[PDB]
A paper describes a structure:
The intrinsically disordered microtubule-associated protein Tau is a highly soluble and abundant cytosolic protein. The microtubule (MT) association of protein Tau is decreased upon phosphorylation. We show that binding of 14-3-3ζ enhances cytosolic Tau solubility by promoting phosphorylated Tau removal from MTs, while simultaneously inhibiting Tau aggregation both directly and indirectly via suppression of condensate formation. These 14-3-3ζ activities depend on site-specific binding of 14-3-3 to Tau phosphorylated at S214 and S324.
The pS2 Tau phospho-peptide consisted of two short Tau sequences with phosphate groups at S214 and S324, connected by an unstructured linker (pS2: 38 aa; Tau210–222-GGGSGGGSGGG-Tau318–331). pS2 showed efficient binding to 14-3-3ζ (KD ~1 M), which also synergistically depended on phosphorylation at S214 and S324, as determined by fluorescent anisotropy and thermal stability assays. In full-length Tau, however, the same peptides are connected by ~100 aa (also largely unstructured with some beta-structure). This, to some extent, limits our interpretation of the binding affinity of pS2 to 14-3-3, which may bind more or less strongly than full-length TaupS214/pS324. The structure and binding mode of 14-3-3ζ dimers in complex with the pS2 peptide in this study were comparable to previous studies using other 14-3-3 isoforms and Tau constructs. Thus, co-condensation of Tau with 14-3-3ζ - being overall acidic (pI of 14-3-3ζ = 4–531;) and having solvent-exposed negative charges on their surface —could be driven by electrostatic interactions, e.g., with the positively charged TauRD. Extrapolation of the pS2:14-3-3 structure to full-length TaupS214/pS324 indicates that 14-3-3 binding would cover and conformationally restrict large parts of the TauRD. Thermal stability assays indicated that full-length PKA Tau may bind even stronger to 14-3-3ζ than the pS2 peptide. It is nevertheless clear that these two phospho-sites are important to the binding of 14-3-3ζ to Tau, and the interaction of 14-3-3ζ with the TauRD explains its compound impact on Tau MT binding, aggregation, and condensation.
Author numbering:
A (entry chain C): 211 to 218, 320 to 330
B (entry chain A): 1 to 69, 71 to 230
C (entry chain B): 1 to 69, 72 to 230
Write the structure that this text describes.
């Protein structure tokens, strides 16, 4: 990340893993 | 771009958190008519879960804001935005559901694949149900239940009780009962049975799947714990 | 429809993490021609920082993949990178058009002028991150020129603890370090801005002390990182 100025429930269904 | 290019591109899009691109690629692959590989099927599912998930999340936030107020014009602003979001969400669901009916379910030659896509059909109708009002709803809820139910029956006949896709179906179908049909009792019973059947046949775990099996088994328990408190 | 409706909609979009909508609303507000309030300016900046930031993030990821590989694979990564660059440029040009046609012309006060000139510097900086060859020297200069005018005004009209002044120093320092690859100038600017702020701690105000001290710490963080 560039350290520039920063700019200031769920259901419980099957998590879809990310690959 | 040939099938291999599109899959490579979908993987790039995923890396770049550009899920609309990812979806677009995998839709084209699907539309080339041939049965999808496991890799391609997962890429399709992930793309669309993320695409639709953004709208689901937005919709809950706006919906919550709408009803929590107030200025009858501020409410009318929130209501109209909600509707804009719902329209996006429905279009996405209809896009997936079209794909299921025209390509994915017809070409599912094996029980595992059939269960996967039927479950997916259940899910996307469930996403529609989350957002439907009145006359439309009973019909959308039924479509969801019917797809889950066909998946469930096949899974129980053709798949071992520890199979991740079977356990995943139980999880989601249990969730359908709890959130859409407001039947916690049925939800608990389904989740509990699927879990119980799995521990009872622990000797069925495979090298390919033992990790996914035990993970989803724990998700079932998490939901049961939450629901019986 | 009316300025009020758009701002309400932009605020909903923000809640919904739908920044493209948020940007679009605040662009319409801006295009109505009247000077933006502080609230509206923050809404505009946030919308566009998020919109452009998603592309910046994507671009770094694809670019990193492109360099880390074969061939044909690199040809695919390169073409995607270019698709993302085109999106990123359109976004930057949209903001920069807004700055030149509405925001900078209408800036009545030094604070506002500094803010928009800083923003001009930033969006040219985003273009520079992604520019190659003949175009670049000119984009880099545009950035430096906008930062530099902002810096001048800030030194004439604004206290050394003013958050917007300190923010500008931070970003301008970053420009020197990342775009012009001049760490000594970057360190010196950041150090000076910090040192001048602690020297005039007297000036911190009810409204601003939190933002002032936060940005002061960001300056130190960057200096610490850079002098290791």
């Amino acid at each position: 990340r560039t350290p520039s100025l920063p700019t200031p429930s769920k259901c419980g269904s099957l998590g879809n893993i990310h690959h | 771009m040939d099938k291999n290019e599109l899959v490579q591109k979908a993987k790039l899009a995923e890396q770049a958190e550009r899920y609309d691109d990812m979806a677009a690629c995998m839709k084209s692959v699907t539309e080339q008519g041939a049965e999808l590989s496991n890799e391609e099927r997962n890429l399709l599912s992930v793309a669309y879960k993320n695409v639709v998930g953004a709208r689901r999340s937005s919709w809950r936030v706006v919906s919550s804001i709408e009803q929590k107020t107030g200025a009858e014009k501020k409410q009318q602003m929130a209501r109209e935005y909600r509707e804009k979001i719902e329209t996006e969400l429905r279009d996405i669901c209809n896009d997936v559901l079209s794909l299921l009916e025209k390509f994915l379910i017809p070409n599912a030659s094996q029980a595992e694949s059939k269960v996967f896509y039927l479950k997916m059909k259940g899910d996307y109708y469930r996403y529609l149900a989350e957002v439907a009002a009145g006359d439309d709803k009973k019909g959308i809820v039924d479509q969801s239940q019917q797809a889950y139910q066909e998946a469930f029956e096949i899974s129980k006949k053709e798949m071992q009780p520890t199979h991740p896709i079977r356990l995943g179906l139980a999880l989601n179908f249990s969730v359908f009962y709890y959130e859409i049909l407001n039947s916690p009792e049925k939800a608990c019973s389904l989740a509990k049975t699927a879990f119980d059947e799995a521990i009872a046949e622990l000797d069925t775990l495979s090298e390919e799947s033992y990790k996914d099996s035990t993970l989803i088994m724990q998700l079932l328990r998490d939901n049961l714990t939450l629901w019986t408190s």
